Structures are given as C-alpha cells and as structure tokens.
Amino acid sequence: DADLAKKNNCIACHQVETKVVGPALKDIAAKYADKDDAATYLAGKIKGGSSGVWGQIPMPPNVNVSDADAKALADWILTLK
Ligand code: HEC
C-alpha cells in the first residue's frame, strides 16, 4: 500500500492516477495486467531501476528497498487495475 510507497519515496515521482515523473501506477497496472510473473518483474524494476519503457528519464534503483517491500509494492500496484 501507499504508506509503504511513501516511506520508500515512490509516491512523489509517481501518483496512482496520473503521470508525474514516472508513469501513473494505474497505467503500470494496466500495461502488465496480462504479463505473467508481472509482480516479480515489477519488484525487479523497482529495485534495480528502469530505462526507456515509458520515456527517456530513467528510474534510478531504489537501493534501500527490501525484496519483501519491493514485492509488496509491485503487488499493490498490480491490484490498481
Ligand atoms: C518506490 C520505491 C517506487 C516504486 C514502487 C516505483 N517507482 Fe518508479 N519510475 C520512475 C520513472 C521515470 C519511471 C519510468 C522509467 C522508464 O521509462 O523505464 C518509473 C517506472 C517505474 C515502474 C515501471 C517499470 C516498468 O518496467 O514499466 C515501476 C513499477 C515503478 N516505477 C515503481 C521514476 C521514479 C522516481 C523518480 C526519481 C522514483 C523515486 C521512483 N520512480 C520510485 C518508485
């Protein structure tokens, strides 16, 4: 949930419903709706960073996020659709 997202600074660069710096969380949700192991995939983007899927500004690695927290954030975002 978004208390986790706040602690881990996700919810400045992102918003649920609309693009800020990073894409809207509900857009991530809809894009990967049918990706399998989408949650592992998104925890991995969250921990190690992302480049070029949504724009030319990359997401740096979120090095202080735990695996469990990255997985919980990814699961939460997936439920957003
Ligand atoms: C807090 C720890 C988080 C979480 C859970 C996520 N982010 Fe970001 N993010 C940012 C940008 C510019 C992008 C697009 C990057 C690109 O074009 O490749 C993203 C992308 C994501 C994704 C999508 C990954 C994918 O493969 O589609 C996800 C799941 C995600 N974020 C979650 C920008 C930022 C930030 C600005 C500095 C910060 C801080 C975060 N994101 C933090 C988080």
Side-chain angles (χ1 to χ4, degrees):
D1 68 12
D3 222 67
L4 202 56
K6 206 196 170 159
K7 272 152 210 323
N8 289 121
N9 288 291
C10 313
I11 222 72
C13 285
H14 294 267
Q15 285 302 304
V16 169
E17 213 73 16
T18 199
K19 186 194 165 160
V20 174
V21 172
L25 295 180
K26 75 138 170 51
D27 288 349
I28 306 299
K31 170 170 185 68
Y32 295 111
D34 274 296
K35 207 194 207 287
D36 45 65
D37 315 309
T40 308
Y41 165 78
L42 293 177
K45 298 316 290 290
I46 298 168
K47 298 169 270 178
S50 190
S51 173
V53 182
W54 301 84
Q56 293 312 302
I57 310 297
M59 180 177 40
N62 295 286
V63 98
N64 296 122
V65 199
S66 70
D67 284 3
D69 293 342
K71 181 61 159 71
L73 291 166
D75 282 319
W76 165 54
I77 290 155
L78 289 176
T79 64
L80 294 169
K81 212 216 87 157

PDB file of all heavy atoms in Angstrom, residues 8-10 13-14 21-23 28 32 41-42 45-46 50-55 57-59 62 65 73, ligand 1:
ATOM      1  N   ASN A   8       9.089   4.740   1.130  1.00  0.00           N
ATOM      2  CA  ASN A   8      10.114   4.332   0.199  1.00  0.00           C
ATOM      3  C   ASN A   8      10.247   5.299  -0.963  1.00  0.00           C
ATOM      4  O   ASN A   8      10.821   4.962  -1.994  1.00  0.00           O
ATOM      5  CB  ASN A   8       9.820   2.908  -0.262  1.00  0.00           C
ATOM      6  CG  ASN A   8      10.058   1.896   0.838  1.00  0.00           C
ATOM      7  OD1 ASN A   8       9.160   1.152   1.254  1.00  0.00           O
ATOM      8  ND2 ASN A   8      11.280   1.857   1.309  1.00  0.00           N
ATOM      9  N   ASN A   9       9.708   6.502  -0.767  1.00  0.00           N
ATOM     10  CA  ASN A   9       9.752   7.616  -1.723  1.00  0.00           C
ATOM     11  C   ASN A   9       9.227   7.403  -3.141  1.00  0.00           C
ATOM     12  O   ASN A   9       9.719   8.033  -4.072  1.00  0.00           O
ATOM     13  CB  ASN A   9      11.143   8.289  -1.727  1.00  0.00           C
ATOM     14  CG  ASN A   9      11.401   9.105  -0.456  1.00  0.00           C
ATOM     15  OD1 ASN A   9      10.767  10.159  -0.217  1.00  0.00           O
ATOM     16  ND2 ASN A   9      12.324   8.617   0.380  1.00  0.00           N
ATOM     17  N   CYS A  10       8.185   6.584  -3.291  1.00  0.00           N
ATOM     18  CA  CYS A  10       7.671   6.197  -4.624  1.00  0.00           C
ATOM     19  C   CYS A  10       6.571   7.089  -5.052  1.00  0.00           C
ATOM     20  O   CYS A  10       6.098   7.015  -6.189  1.00  0.00           O
ATOM     21  CB  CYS A  10       6.986   4.841  -4.583  1.00  0.00           C
ATOM     22  SG  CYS A  10       7.905   3.579  -3.721  1.00  0.00           S
ATOM     23  N   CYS A  13       7.514  10.843  -7.096  1.00  0.00           N
ATOM     24  CA  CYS A  13       7.707  10.586  -8.535  1.00  0.00           C
ATOM     25  C   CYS A  13       6.527   9.908  -9.220  1.00  0.00           C
ATOM     26  O   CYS A  13       6.366  10.048 -10.427  1.00  0.00           O
ATOM     27  CB  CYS A  13       8.957   9.722  -8.742  1.00  0.00           C
ATOM     28  SG  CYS A  13      10.492  10.645  -8.514  1.00  0.00           S
ATOM     29  N   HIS A  14       5.733   9.152  -8.460  1.00  0.00           N
ATOM     30  CA  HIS A  14       4.554   8.507  -9.034  1.00  0.00           C
ATOM     31  C   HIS A  14       3.271   8.984  -8.327  1.00  0.00           C
ATOM     32  O   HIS A  14       3.307   9.390  -7.173  1.00  0.00           O
ATOM     33  CB  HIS A  14       4.613   6.974  -8.917  1.00  0.00           C
ATOM     34  CG  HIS A  14       5.702   6.325  -9.707  1.00  0.00           C
ATOM     35  ND1 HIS A  14       5.517   5.852 -10.992  1.00  0.00           N
ATOM     36  CD2 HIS A  14       6.967   5.993  -9.369  1.00  0.00           C
ATOM     37  CE1 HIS A  14       6.627   5.293 -11.424  1.00  0.00           C
ATOM     38  NE2 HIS A  14       7.522   5.354 -10.457  1.00  0.00           N
ATOM     39  N   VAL A  21       6.646  12.203 -12.598  1.00  0.00           N
ATOM     40  CA  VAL A  21       7.952  11.941 -13.230  1.00  0.00           C
ATOM     41  C   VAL A  21       7.881  10.551 -13.871  1.00  0.00           C
ATOM     42  O   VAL A  21       8.146  10.404 -15.064  1.00  0.00           O
ATOM     43  CB  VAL A  21       9.124  12.076 -12.232  1.00  0.00           C
ATOM     44  CG1 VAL A  21      10.466  11.615 -12.841  1.00  0.00           C
ATOM     45  CG2 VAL A  21       9.240  13.532 -11.712  1.00  0.00           C
ATOM     46  N   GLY A  22       7.478   9.560 -13.075  1.00  0.00           N
ATOM     47  CA  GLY A  22       7.310   8.205 -13.526  1.00  0.00           C
ATOM     48  C   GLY A  22       5.904   7.998 -14.014  1.00  0.00           C
ATOM     49  O   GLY A  22       5.047   8.826 -13.802  1.00  0.00           O
ATOM     50  N   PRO A  23       5.635   6.886 -14.702  1.00  0.00           N
ATOM     51  CA  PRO A  23       4.238   6.692 -15.102  1.00  0.00           C
ATOM     52  C   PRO A  23       3.250   6.507 -13.928  1.00  0.00           C
ATOM     53  O   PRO A  23       3.641   6.157 -12.827  1.00  0.00           O
ATOM     54  CB  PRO A  23       4.309   5.438 -15.915  1.00  0.00           C
ATOM     55  CG  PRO A  23       5.461   4.700 -15.285  1.00  0.00           C
ATOM     56  CD  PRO A  23       6.472   5.794 -15.185  1.00  0.00           C
ATOM     57  N   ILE A  28       0.717   1.461 -14.980  1.00  0.00           N
ATOM     58  CA  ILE A  28       1.654   0.330 -14.909  1.00  0.00           C
ATOM     59  C   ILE A  28       0.813  -0.921 -14.823  1.00  0.00           C
ATOM     60  O   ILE A  28       1.083  -1.908 -15.475  1.00  0.00           O
ATOM     61  CB  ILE A  28       2.504   0.325 -13.638  1.00  0.00           C
ATOM     62  CG1 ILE A  28       3.252   1.661 -13.429  1.00  0.00           C
ATOM     63  CG2 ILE A  28       3.336  -0.964 -13.566  1.00  0.00           C
ATOM     64  CD1 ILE A  28       4.183   2.005 -14.510  1.00  0.00           C
ATOM     65  N   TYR A  32       0.664  -4.207 -17.578  1.00  0.00           N
ATOM     66  CA  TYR A  32       1.229  -5.535 -17.267  1.00  0.00           C
ATOM     67  C   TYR A  32       0.143  -6.504 -16.848  1.00  0.00           C
ATOM     68  O   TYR A  32       0.451  -7.647 -16.459  1.00  0.00           O
ATOM     69  CB  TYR A  32       2.344  -5.424 -16.168  1.00  0.00           C
ATOM     70  CG  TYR A  32       3.514  -4.618 -16.704  1.00  0.00           C
ATOM     71  CD1 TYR A  32       3.806  -3.353 -16.192  1.00  0.00           C
ATOM     72  CD2 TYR A  32       4.255  -5.074 -17.823  1.00  0.00           C
ATOM     73  CE1 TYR A  32       4.806  -2.569 -16.726  1.00  0.00           C
ATOM     74  CE2 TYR A  32       5.291  -4.310 -18.362  1.00  0.00           C
ATOM     75  CZ  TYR A  32       5.550  -3.057 -17.799  1.00  0.00           C
ATOM     76  OH  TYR A  32       6.568  -2.289 -18.281  1.00  0.00           O
ATOM     77  N   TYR A  41       8.603  -9.220 -11.968  1.00  0.00           N
ATOM     78  CA  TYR A  41       9.154  -8.299 -12.913  1.00  0.00           C
ATOM     79  C   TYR A  41       9.134  -6.878 -12.380  1.00  0.00           C
ATOM     80  O   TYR A  41      10.079  -6.175 -12.515  1.00  0.00           O
ATOM     81  CB  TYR A  41       8.364  -8.376 -14.194  1.00  0.00           C
ATOM     82  CG  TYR A  41       8.638  -7.222 -15.086  1.00  0.00           C
ATOM     83  CD1 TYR A  41       9.805  -7.182 -15.853  1.00  0.00           C
ATOM     84  CD2 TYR A  41       7.733  -6.154 -15.163  1.00  0.00           C
ATOM     85  CE1 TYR A  41      10.073  -6.123 -16.661  1.00  0.00           C
ATOM     86  CE2 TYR A  41       7.972  -5.079 -16.027  1.00  0.00           C
ATOM     87  CZ  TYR A  41       9.153  -5.071 -16.790  1.00  0.00           C
ATOM     88  OH  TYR A  41       9.451  -3.983 -17.617  1.00  0.00           O
ATOM     89  N   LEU A  42       8.066  -6.461 -11.726  1.00  0.00           N
ATOM     90  CA  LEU A  42       7.968  -5.072 -11.277  1.00  0.00           C
ATOM     91  C   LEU A  42       8.822  -4.889 -10.009  1.00  0.00           C
ATOM     92  O   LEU A  42       9.559  -3.880  -9.859  1.00  0.00           O
ATOM     93  CB  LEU A  42       6.514  -4.633 -11.101  1.00  0.00           C
ATOM     94  CG  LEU A  42       5.581  -4.515 -12.322  1.00  0.00           C
ATOM     95  CD1 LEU A  42       4.122  -4.120 -11.967  1.00  0.00           C
ATOM     96  CD2 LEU A  42       6.134  -3.486 -13.322  1.00  0.00           C
ATOM     97  N   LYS A  45      12.126  -4.207 -11.413  1.00  0.00           N
ATOM     98  CA  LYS A  45      12.323  -2.829 -11.922  1.00  0.00           C
ATOM     99  C   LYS A  45      12.440  -1.864 -10.802  1.00  0.00           C
ATOM    100  O   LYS A  45      13.255  -0.950 -10.862  1.00  0.00           O
ATOM    101  CB  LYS A  45      11.152  -2.398 -12.811  1.00  0.00           C
ATOM    102  CG  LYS A  45      11.001  -3.289 -14.051  1.00  0.00           C
ATOM    103  CD  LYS A  45      12.345  -3.570 -14.725  1.00  0.00           C
ATOM    104  CE  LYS A  45      12.878  -2.323 -15.390  1.00  0.00           C
ATOM    105  NZ  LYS A  45      12.079  -1.945 -16.597  1.00  0.00           N
ATOM    106  N   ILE A  46      11.588  -2.019  -9.777  1.00  0.00           N
ATOM    107  CA  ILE A  46      11.683  -1.167  -8.588  1.00  0.00           C
ATOM    108  C   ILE A  46      13.039  -1.203  -7.878  1.00  0.00           C
ATOM    109  O   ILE A  46      13.555  -0.120  -7.458  1.00  0.00           O
ATOM    110  CB  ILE A  46      10.590  -1.577  -7.564  1.00  0.00           C
ATOM    111  CG1 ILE A  46       9.211  -1.360  -8.223  1.00  0.00           C
ATOM    112  CG2 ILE A  46      10.782  -0.907  -6.190  1.00  0.00           C
ATOM    113  CD1 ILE A  46       8.111  -1.990  -7.437  1.00  0.00           C
ATOM    114  N   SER A  50      14.964   1.390 -14.003  1.00  0.00           N
ATOM    115  CA  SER A  50      14.252   1.231 -15.276  1.00  0.00           C
ATOM    116  C   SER A  50      14.625   2.290 -16.259  1.00  0.00           C
ATOM    117  O   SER A  50      14.768   3.481 -15.914  1.00  0.00           O
ATOM    118  CB  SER A  50      12.735   1.302 -15.057  1.00  0.00           C
ATOM    119  OG  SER A  50      12.022   0.920 -16.207  1.00  0.00           O
ATOM    120  N   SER A  51      14.729   1.897 -17.522  1.00  0.00           N
ATOM    121  CA  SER A  51      15.108   2.863 -18.525  1.00  0.00           C
ATOM    122  C   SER A  51      14.359   2.570 -19.793  1.00  0.00           C
ATOM    123  O   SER A  51      14.380   1.425 -20.268  1.00  0.00           O
ATOM    124  CB  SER A  51      16.605   2.727 -18.763  1.00  0.00           C
ATOM    125  OG  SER A  51      17.041   3.509 -19.836  1.00  0.00           O
ATOM    126  N   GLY A  52      13.714   3.596 -20.363  1.00  0.00           N
ATOM    127  CA  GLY A  52      13.168   3.503 -21.702  1.00  0.00           C
ATOM    128  C   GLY A  52      11.844   2.825 -21.944  1.00  0.00           C
ATOM    129  O   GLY A  52      11.351   2.811 -23.085  1.00  0.00           O
ATOM    130  N   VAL A  53      11.196   2.334 -20.916  1.00  0.00           N
ATOM    131  CA  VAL A  53       9.902   1.680 -21.131  1.00  0.00           C
ATOM    132  C   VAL A  53       8.821   2.748 -21.246  1.00  0.00           C
ATOM    133  O   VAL A  53       7.841   2.551 -21.992  1.00  0.00           O
ATOM    134  CB  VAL A  53       9.572   0.735 -19.977  1.00  0.00           C
ATOM    135  CG1 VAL A  53       8.256   0.020 -20.195  1.00  0.00           C
ATOM    136  CG2 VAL A  53      10.713  -0.265 -19.726  1.00  0.00           C
ATOM    137  N   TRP A  54       8.979   3.881 -20.535  1.00  0.00           N
ATOM    138  CA  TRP A  54       7.978   4.931 -20.535  1.00  0.00           C
ATOM    139  C   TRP A  54       8.490   6.266 -21.039  1.00  0.00           C
ATOM    140  O   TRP A  54       7.687   7.142 -21.352  1.00  0.00           O
ATOM    141  CB  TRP A  54       7.413   5.180 -19.133  1.00  0.00           C
ATOM    142  CG  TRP A  54       6.791   3.944 -18.583  1.00  0.00           C
ATOM    143  CD1 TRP A  54       7.431   2.953 -17.956  1.00  0.00           C
ATOM    144  CD2 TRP A  54       5.404   3.552 -18.691  1.00  0.00           C
ATOM    145  NE1 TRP A  54       6.541   1.949 -17.633  1.00  0.00           N
ATOM    146  CE2 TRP A  54       5.284   2.308 -18.056  1.00  0.00           C
ATOM    147  CE3 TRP A  54       4.261   4.156 -19.226  1.00  0.00           C
ATOM    148  CZ2 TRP A  54       4.083   1.620 -17.973  1.00  0.00           C
ATOM    149  CZ3 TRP A  54       3.046   3.453 -19.165  1.00  0.00           C
ATOM    150  CH2 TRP A  54       2.979   2.203 -18.535  1.00  0.00           C
ATOM    151  N   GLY A  55       9.807   6.465 -21.118  1.00  0.00           N
ATOM    152  CA  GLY A  55      10.298   7.769 -21.506  1.00  0.00           C
ATOM    153  C   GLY A  55      11.768   7.730 -21.480  1.00  0.00           C
ATOM    154  O   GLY A  55      12.346   6.663 -21.324  1.00  0.00           O
ATOM    155  N   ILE A  57      13.617   9.665 -19.253  1.00  0.00           N
ATOM    156  CA  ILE A  57      14.104   9.874 -17.914  1.00  0.00           C
ATOM    157  C   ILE A  57      14.075   8.521 -17.209  1.00  0.00           C
ATOM    158  O   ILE A  57      13.018   7.930 -17.064  1.00  0.00           O
ATOM    159  CB  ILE A  57      13.156  10.716 -17.076  1.00  0.00           C
ATOM    160  CG1 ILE A  57      12.742  11.988 -17.767  1.00  0.00           C
ATOM    161  CG2 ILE A  57      13.746  10.913 -15.664  1.00  0.00           C
ATOM    162  CD1 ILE A  57      13.887  12.943 -18.035  1.00  0.00           C
ATOM    163  N   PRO A  58      15.218   8.038 -16.743  1.00  0.00           N
ATOM    164  CA  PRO A  58      15.222   6.693 -16.158  1.00  0.00           C
ATOM    165  C   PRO A  58      14.763   6.729 -14.713  1.00  0.00           C
ATOM    166  O   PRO A  58      14.837   7.800 -14.119  1.00  0.00           O
ATOM    167  CB  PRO A  58      16.665   6.288 -16.243  1.00  0.00           C
ATOM    168  CG  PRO A  58      17.464   7.559 -16.304  1.00  0.00           C
ATOM    169  CD  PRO A  58      16.562   8.612 -16.900  1.00  0.00           C
ATOM    170  N   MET A  59      14.257   5.606 -14.161  1.00  0.00           N
ATOM    171  CA  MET A  59      14.058   5.480 -12.730  1.00  0.00           C
ATOM    172  C   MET A  59      15.352   4.937 -12.124  1.00  0.00           C
ATOM    173  O   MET A  59      15.753   3.823 -12.472  1.00  0.00           O
ATOM    174  CB  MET A  59      12.937   4.492 -12.401  1.00  0.00           C
ATOM    175  CG  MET A  59      12.723   4.368 -10.878  1.00  0.00           C
ATOM    176  SD  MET A  59      11.399   3.309 -10.255  1.00  0.00           S
ATOM    177  CE  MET A  59      11.472   1.898 -11.352  1.00  0.00           C
ATOM    178  N   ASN A  62      16.155   1.654  -6.528  1.00  0.00           N
ATOM    179  CA  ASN A  62      15.723   2.005  -5.216  1.00  0.00           C
ATOM    180  C   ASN A  62      16.497   1.071  -4.254  1.00  0.00           C
ATOM    181  O   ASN A  62      16.004   0.056  -3.759  1.00  0.00           O
ATOM    182  CB  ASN A  62      14.203   1.895  -5.154  1.00  0.00           C
ATOM    183  CG  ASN A  62      13.521   2.922  -6.062  1.00  0.00           C
ATOM    184  OD1 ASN A  62      13.483   4.102  -5.770  1.00  0.00           O
ATOM    185  ND2 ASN A  62      13.036   2.476  -7.182  1.00  0.00           N
ATOM    186  N   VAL A  65      15.287  -0.213  -0.843  1.00  0.00           N
ATOM    187  CA  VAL A  65      14.096  -1.051  -0.681  1.00  0.00           C
ATOM    188  C   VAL A  65      14.448  -2.521  -0.438  1.00  0.00           C
ATOM    189  O   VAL A  65      15.311  -3.090  -1.127  1.00  0.00           O
ATOM    190  CB  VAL A  65      13.113  -0.924  -1.846  1.00  0.00           C
ATOM    191  CG1 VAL A  65      11.741  -1.416  -1.403  1.00  0.00           C
ATOM    192  CG2 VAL A  65      12.979   0.535  -2.224  1.00  0.00           C
ATOM    193  N   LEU A  73       5.039  -3.672  -2.894  1.00  0.00           N
ATOM    194  CA  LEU A  73       4.726  -2.511  -3.728  1.00  0.00           C
ATOM    195  C   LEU A  73       4.258  -2.954  -5.137  1.00  0.00           C
ATOM    196  O   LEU A  73       3.266  -2.461  -5.678  1.00  0.00           O
ATOM    197  CB  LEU A  73       5.935  -1.590  -3.830  1.00  0.00           C
ATOM    198  CG  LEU A  73       6.335  -0.839  -2.557  1.00  0.00           C
ATOM    199  CD1 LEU A  73       7.721  -0.238  -2.695  1.00  0.00           C
ATOM    200  CD2 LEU A  73       5.304   0.235  -2.266  1.00  0.00           C
TER     201      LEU A  73
HETATM  202  C1  HEC B   1       9.322   3.458  -4.945  1.00  0.00           C
HETATM  203  C2  HEC B   1      10.293   2.685  -4.370  1.00  0.00           C
HETATM  204  C3  HEC B   1       8.968   3.273  -6.371  1.00  0.00           C
HETATM  205  C4  HEC B   1       8.204   2.306  -6.943  1.00  0.00           C
HETATM  206  C5  HEC B   1       7.491   1.173  -6.260  1.00  0.00           C
HETATM  207  C6  HEC B   1       8.227   2.556  -8.382  1.00  0.00           C
HETATM  208  N1  HEC B   1       8.969   3.637  -8.612  1.00  0.00           N
HETATM  209 FE1  HEC B   1       9.325   4.470 -10.483  1.00  0.00          FE
HETATM  210  N2  HEC B   1       9.672   5.239 -12.229  1.00  0.00           N
HETATM  211  C7  HEC B   1      10.172   6.451 -12.499  1.00  0.00           C
HETATM  212  C8  HEC B   1      10.282   6.645 -13.949  1.00  0.00           C
HETATM  213  C9  HEC B   1      10.779   7.902 -14.685  1.00  0.00           C
HETATM  214  C10 HEC B   1       9.811   5.513 -14.493  1.00  0.00           C
HETATM  215  C11 HEC B   1       9.744   5.178 -15.969  1.00  0.00           C
HETATM  216  C12 HEC B   1      11.121   4.572 -16.312  1.00  0.00           C
HETATM  217  C13 HEC B   1      11.240   4.039 -17.726  1.00  0.00           C
HETATM  218  O1  HEC B   1      10.848   4.703 -18.715  1.00  0.00           O
HETATM  219  O2  HEC B   1      11.778   2.926 -17.934  1.00  0.00           O
HETATM  220  C14 HEC B   1       9.475   4.659 -13.403  1.00  0.00           C
HETATM  221  C15 HEC B   1       8.996   3.411 -13.642  1.00  0.00           C
HETATM  222  C16 HEC B   1       8.517   2.645 -12.626  1.00  0.00           C
HETATM  223  C17 HEC B   1       7.935   1.386 -12.875  1.00  0.00           C
HETATM  224  C18 HEC B   1       7.780   0.798 -14.247  1.00  0.00           C
HETATM  225  C19 HEC B   1       8.849  -0.226 -14.645  1.00  0.00           C
HETATM  226  C20 HEC B   1       8.478  -0.892 -15.956  1.00  0.00           C
HETATM  227  O3  HEC B   1       9.194  -1.850 -16.343  1.00  0.00           O
HETATM  228  O4  HEC B   1       7.494  -0.474 -16.632  1.00  0.00           O
HETATM  229  C21 HEC B   1       7.517   0.914 -11.678  1.00  0.00           C
HETATM  230  C22 HEC B   1       6.839  -0.397 -11.402  1.00  0.00           C
HETATM  231  C23 HEC B   1       7.867   1.874 -10.671  1.00  0.00           C
HETATM  232  N3  HEC B   1       8.471   2.934 -11.295  1.00  0.00           N
HETATM  233  C24 HEC B   1       7.598   1.746  -9.325  1.00  0.00           C
HETATM  234  C25 HEC B   1      10.540   7.469 -11.583  1.00  0.00           C
HETATM  235  C26 HEC B   1      10.648   7.192 -10.255  1.00  0.00           C
HETATM  236  C27 HEC B   1      11.280   8.057  -9.290  1.00  0.00           C
HETATM  237  C28 HEC B   1      11.887   9.394  -9.586  1.00  0.00           C
HETATM  238  C29 HEC B   1      13.147   9.659  -9.201  1.00  0.00           C
HETATM  239  C30 HEC B   1      11.203   7.411  -8.063  1.00  0.00           C
HETATM  240  C31 HEC B   1      11.720   7.916  -6.744  1.00  0.00           C
HETATM  241  C32 HEC B   1      10.548   6.162  -8.264  1.00  0.00           C
HETATM  242  N4  HEC B   1      10.205   6.068  -9.597  1.00  0.00           N
HETATM  243  C33 HEC B   1      10.259   5.229  -7.264  1.00  0.00           C
HETATM  244  C34 HEC B   1       9.453   4.137  -7.463  1.00  0.00           C
END
